[PDB]
Design an enzyme around this catalytic site. Structure first.
Site, PDB file in Angstrom:
ATOM      1  N   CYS B  96      -2.513 -22.625  48.620  1.00 50.46           N
ATOM      2  CA  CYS B  96      -3.910 -22.180  48.438  1.00 50.46           C
ATOM      3  C   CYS B  96      -4.943 -23.303  48.278  1.00 50.46           C
ATOM      4  CB  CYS B  96      -4.052 -21.169  47.292  1.00 50.46           C
ATOM      5  SG  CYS B  96      -2.511 -20.625  46.526  1.00 50.46           S
ATOM      6  N   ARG B 125       9.575 -25.628  44.270  1.00 50.80           N
ATOM      7  CA  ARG B 125       9.374 -25.188  42.896  1.00 50.80           C
ATOM      8  C   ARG B 125      10.585 -25.594  42.069  1.00 50.80           C
ATOM      9  NH1 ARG B 125       6.284 -19.258  43.484  1.00 50.80           N
ATOM     10  NH2 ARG B 125       4.746 -20.021  45.009  1.00 50.80           N
ATOM     11  N   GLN B 143       7.189 -20.224  52.995  1.00 50.31           N
ATOM     12  CA  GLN B 143       6.473 -18.963  52.978  1.00 50.31           C
ATOM     13  C   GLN B 143       5.799 -18.738  54.319  1.00 50.31           C
ATOM     14  OE1 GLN B 143       3.568 -19.103  49.920  1.00 50.31           O
ATOM     15  NE2 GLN B 143       4.995 -18.698  48.231  1.00 50.31           N
ATOM     16  N   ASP B 145       2.842 -17.949  54.686  1.00 51.68           N
ATOM     17  CA  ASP B 145       1.684 -17.872  53.806  1.00 51.68           C
ATOM     18  C   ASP B 145       0.413 -17.632  54.600  1.00 51.68           C
ATOM     19  OD1 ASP B 145       0.292 -17.874  51.435  1.00 51.68           O
ATOM     20  OD2 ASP B 145       0.265 -20.061  51.197  1.00 51.68           O
ATOM     21  N   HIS B 147      -4.117 -17.121  53.790  1.00 53.47           N
ATOM     22  CA  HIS B 147      -5.241 -16.928  52.891  1.00 53.47           C
ATOM     23  C   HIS B 147      -6.443 -16.410  53.653  1.00 53.47           C
ATOM     24  CE1 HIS B 147      -2.698 -19.859  50.668  1.00 53.47           C
ATOM     25  NE2 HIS B 147      -3.000 -19.048  49.673  1.00 53.47           N
ATOM     26  N   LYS B 231      -2.131  -8.623  41.694  1.00 53.45           N
ATOM     27  CA  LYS B 231      -1.525  -8.533  43.015  1.00 53.45           C
ATOM     28  C   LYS B 231      -0.700  -7.275  43.227  1.00 53.45           C
ATOM     29  CE  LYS B 231       1.995 -11.842  41.434  1.00 53.45           C
ATOM     30  NZ  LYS B 231       3.366 -11.881  42.019  1.00 53.45           N
ATOM     31  N   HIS B 277      -4.623 -13.743  48.898  1.00 54.38           N
ATOM     32  CA  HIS B 277      -3.400 -14.461  49.251  1.00 54.38           C
ATOM     33  C   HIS B 277      -2.423 -13.415  49.750  1.00 54.38           C
ATOM     34  CE1 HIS B 277      -4.613 -17.749  46.233  1.00 54.38           C
ATOM     35  NE2 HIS B 277      -5.490 -16.774  46.098  1.00 54.38           N
TER      36      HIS B 277
HETATM   37  C1  TSB Z   1       1.336 -15.732  48.536  1.00 53.81           C
HETATM   38  C2  TSB Z   1       0.763 -17.118  48.361  1.00 53.81           C
HETATM   39  O1  TSB Z   1      -0.467 -17.224  49.016  1.00 53.81           O
HETATM   40  C3  TSB Z   1       0.675 -17.452  46.878  1.00 53.81           C
HETATM   41  N1  TSB Z   1       0.181 -18.759  46.595  1.00 53.81           N
HETATM   42  C4  TSB Z   1       2.034 -17.405  46.350  1.00 53.81           C
HETATM   43  O2  TSB Z   1       2.738 -18.400  46.382  1.00 53.81           O
HETATM   44  N2  TSB Z   1       2.544 -16.155  45.813  1.00 53.81           N
HETATM   45  S1  TSB Z   1       4.136 -16.075  45.210  1.00 53.81           S
HETATM   46  O3  TSB Z   1       4.274 -17.050  44.097  1.00 53.81           O
HETATM   47  O4  TSB Z   1       4.398 -14.668  44.715  1.00 53.81           O
HETATM   48  O5  TSB Z   1       5.118 -16.417  46.296  1.00 53.81           O
HETATM   49  C5  TSB Z   1       5.314 -15.541  47.384  1.00 53.81           C
HETATM   50  C6  TSB Z   1       6.666 -15.195  47.797  1.00 53.81           C
HETATM   51  O6  TSB Z   1       7.513 -16.390  47.927  1.00 53.81           O
HETATM   52  C7  TSB Z   1       8.825 -16.022  47.558  1.00 53.81           C
HETATM   53  N3  TSB Z   1       9.367 -16.965  46.590  1.00 53.81           N
HETATM   54  C8  TSB Z   1       8.783 -17.323  45.453  1.00 53.81           C
HETATM   55  N4  TSB Z   1       9.595 -18.199  44.823  1.00 53.81           N
HETATM   56  C9  TSB Z   1      10.712 -18.388  45.576  1.00 53.81           C
HETATM   57  C10 TSB Z   1      11.890 -19.185  45.411  1.00 53.81           C
HETATM   58  N5  TSB Z   1      12.050 -20.008  44.253  1.00 53.81           N
HETATM   59  N6  TSB Z   1      12.809 -19.144  46.337  1.00 53.81           N
HETATM   60  C11 TSB Z   1      12.652 -18.367  47.435  1.00 53.81           C
HETATM   61  N7  TSB Z   1      11.562 -17.612  47.619  1.00 53.81           N
HETATM   62  C12 TSB Z   1      10.583 -17.605  46.705  1.00 53.81           C
HETATM   63  C13 TSB Z   1       8.756 -14.626  47.032  1.00 53.81           C
HETATM   64  O7  TSB Z   1       9.203 -13.770  47.968  1.00 53.81           O
HETATM   65  C14 TSB Z   1       7.334 -14.398  46.755  1.00 53.81           C
HETATM   66  O8  TSB Z   1       7.015 -13.075  46.877  1.00 53.81           O
HETATM   67 ZN    ZN Z   2      -1.913 -18.481  47.757  1.00 52.91          ZN
END
Ligand code: TSB
Ligand code: ZN
Ligand code: TSB
Ligand code: ZN
Lengths: 420, 420
Positions: B96, B125, B143, B145, B147, B231, B277
């Site tokens: 983001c 992460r 992702q 992803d 926006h 969300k 997002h």
């Molecule tokens: C959606 C983005 O724009 C926002 N910044 C975001 O990161 N949202 S999130 O934190 O919910 O992440 C989105 C998706 O990534 C996936 N995700 C999150 N963490 C992990 C992980 N540690 N390993 C694998 N997939 C993950 C999940 O499916 C989650 O729904």
């Molecule tokens: Zn985001």
């Protein structure tokens, strides 16, 4: 008075290609148009690597523990140029060690050699801020990387195949400004190298022999070999006569030894594979910079983020507007968000814009020419009458054609198909 | 007695999909077959996003200086789960902030809203090692992803379009094992949030209204909203009745304020955009894990790294071998490395193998069934006579067809085109 770097910034500002921010020095932002070019290049290279040159793509971690880089010899050679990661970690500046891990994970038979892995991972190198220049030298970049595992008797043919791919890129598909658009640097044993000196002399001998058999012009480049092996560095010259290293082919007897790599040979003997490192673009970023140095923004059709513009003579004429809109819709080939029908695989989609701004026809044209659209498509009353569009190519504005919607569709297809 | 995680490891071992190494805990290795699936999913999603749902792809840095993450509010919310980078740097866990930098780099008119950026960057992460599980929870993942920057009056329609894409994925293209293959969690203001409480209540009201208008089943999920906004979390249930968060849609009034984002409105007033997002797969990795939980390795044709196997009844019969080789060459559609002809764009290439091992025909068949090939193609003397292949589908082995080379080519095309 423009430099290559300045040329890249001028084109990028005209076509909205890239941007930079001090919050991430040396890392490029690819804006939509810049990202289209980037992705197109990768699409092209993946096709050649998978369906012509026998590569299998892999996706590898970006961070590895300190130990891997010590085992590979990277940590004691490069660690100043390596971003460390903290929770004992190194952000990868190279893919090779990861590929050694993949090789050594399964029993390997001589029957699956040459084993060829490709990898488009983002790489990071902690380049000194004074060394940063446009897209040629960055802290983050993507290599069209590839590692080959073969037997001694396969080395030659594998390197010639790498050289074939290099010629398709530098001497066929892409124009640049010797008959060849590059020369080869024979880069030899550097001060800091791993492995015995006998093996090193043999690797250099094998490479020189291949260089001689190729018949391509080369230059001795002492001390510039990788720390794991000598290499052929493909050098291209920008319009300021400065040379840039793009493609590279590296002969590596050393990493296999340090990862205890083995494969079962024809005689059921276990033997070390040889490793060849290779990149054709070098990095997608630096390659793009050199394309721009040559084309000054005048992309070939298949690469152009601005493939065609459609311009009605009178922006308030409904007949002209309809005809223009019909063509844009045809060439873009998009679907509406309102139904559940997905965009199918392998359809054609062209980057076609419609300029209906309330601006004199003359200026809208000039605007499109500034942006380097591959094709200008004009529709006036006569064109509505014939239901045929006036279409002309960018670099040959004097001649033109009158084509139907269907004929432009097929024309654009044939162009993109075969990299025109 | 198998778990989802165990199912993923069993399939991966059978089909050579992925691997792990302790030198990079929580980061997956995609082997050739695993990478084919990964890349196919991304290809599918890019097509929907670019040519149906109005997204423009961007490519952004992976590391940003400490200041960006402080400005965004990530550094004080998440920094324990953030890999720091050392030469003051943070390895991104989210895209983001980078997208806010792109928005704020140009003057923006209300005329270009909704502005939609997509990004497939690798994210990291620092998940606790006890939380790591197969492909569902990793330290590195990608992702799909995206926006969106819109006006207040565009929010609803943009979210419904996001929901349309979600249904194409979860309720049309992919089978999984309510009529819908997911339910929605309405995730509300968490303990640690930025921004005023009035704005927060408004965002939650807008979301609830949209949820109610959609008619889809939802559950209150208090305290689980992002730190920047509430969300809709799309939850799918594995075969052990455990729920997993995949797609997500997040309504963000907060980041725009902290980056001083503005756009010129219809009245020449400067106004803050709202940010949404959204991710459809969630992460490609976790989505793949859930596909595997459902299909147990029985990939649909278009996704299968094992699309067809060709088996001669007699591996020493030249007539059968020729016929088998002719078909493999046709379906793979590769080019020889020996000429300068490149692989063209938009050609079809199928994952077709030939099993000529010196093994009883019966066992070679059994081998292919273990690997879950979408199609089994057998050639005996009768097939040579007719010059027609015996072809049968994996999940319907009892029926079959006798088709020419050309008919199998077109059949496989139609299957891949339309995601069968
Ligand atoms: C959606 C983005 O724009 C926002 N910044 C975001 O990161 N949202 S999130 O934190 O919910 O992440 C989105 C998706 O990534 C996936 N995700 C999150 N963490 C992990 C992980 N540690 N390993 C694998 N997939 C993950 C999940 O499916 C989650 O729904
Ligand atoms: Zn985001
Ligand atoms: C080729 C690989 O298998 C090998 N490990 C390798 O990395 N060789 S390399 O160091 O020579 O890198 C290959 C190419 O990447 C490009 N490259 C290297 N550093 C940068 C940089 N800082 N910015 C942009 N491109 C770079 C060059 O074109 C170079 O030829
Ligand atoms: Zn390498």
């Amino acid at each position: 008075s423009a430099t290559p770097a300045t040329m890249t910034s001028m084109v990028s500002q005209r076509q909205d290609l890239f941007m930079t921010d001090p919050l991430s020095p040396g890392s490029m932002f690819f804006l939509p148009n810049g990202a289209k070019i980037f992705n197109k290049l990768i699409e092209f290279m993946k096709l050649q690597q998978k369906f012509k040159f026998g590569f299998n793509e892999v996706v590898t971690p970006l961070i590895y523990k300190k130990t891997l880089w010590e085992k590979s010899g990277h940590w004691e050679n490069y660690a100043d140029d390596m971003f460390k990661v903290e929770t004992e970690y190194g952000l990868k500046p190279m893919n090779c060690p990861g590929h050694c891990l993949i090789f050594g994970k399964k029993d390997r038979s001589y029957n699956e050699l040459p084993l060829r892995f490709s990898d488009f991972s983002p790489l990071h190198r902690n380049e000194a801020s004074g060394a940063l220049s446009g897209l040629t030298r960055l802290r983050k970049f993507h290599q069209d990387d590839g590692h080959i595992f073969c037997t001694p008797s396969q080395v030659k043919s594998e390197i010639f195949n790498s050289l074939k791919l290099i010629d398709i890129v530098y001497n066929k598909i892409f124009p640049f400004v010797a008959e060849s658009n590059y020369f080869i640097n024979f880069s030899t044993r550097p001060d800091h190298f791993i492995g015995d000196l006998k093996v090193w002399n043999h690797a250099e001998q094998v490479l020189k022999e291949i260089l001689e058999e190729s018949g391509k012009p080369w230059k001795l480049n002492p001390g510039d070999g990788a720390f794991y092996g000598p290499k052929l560095d493909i050098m291209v010259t920008d319009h300021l006569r400065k040379t840039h290293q793009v493609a590279t082919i590296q002969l590596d007897f050393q990493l296999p030894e340090r990862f205890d790599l083995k494969f079962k040979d024809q005689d059921n003997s276990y033997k070390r594979p040889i490793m060849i490192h290779r990149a054709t673009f070098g990095s997608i970023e630096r390659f793009m910079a050199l394309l721009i140095d040559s084309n000054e923004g005048r992309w070939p059709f298949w690469l152009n983020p601005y493939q065609a513009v459609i311009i009605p003579v009178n922006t308030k004429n409904v007949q002209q507007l309809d005809m223009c809109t019909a063509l844009q819709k045809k060439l873009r080939n998009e679907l509406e968000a309102d139904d559940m029908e997905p965009v199918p695989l392998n359809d054609w989609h062209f980057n076609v814009d419609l300029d209906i701004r309330n601006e004199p026809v003359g200026y809208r044209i000039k605007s499109a020419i500034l942006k380097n659209y591959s094709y200008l498509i004009i529709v006036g009353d006569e064109e509505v009458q014939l239901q045929k569009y006036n279409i002309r190519e960018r670099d040959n504005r004097k001649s033109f054609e009158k084509l139907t919607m269907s004929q432009i569709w097929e024309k654009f297809i044939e162009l993109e198909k075969n990299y025109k």
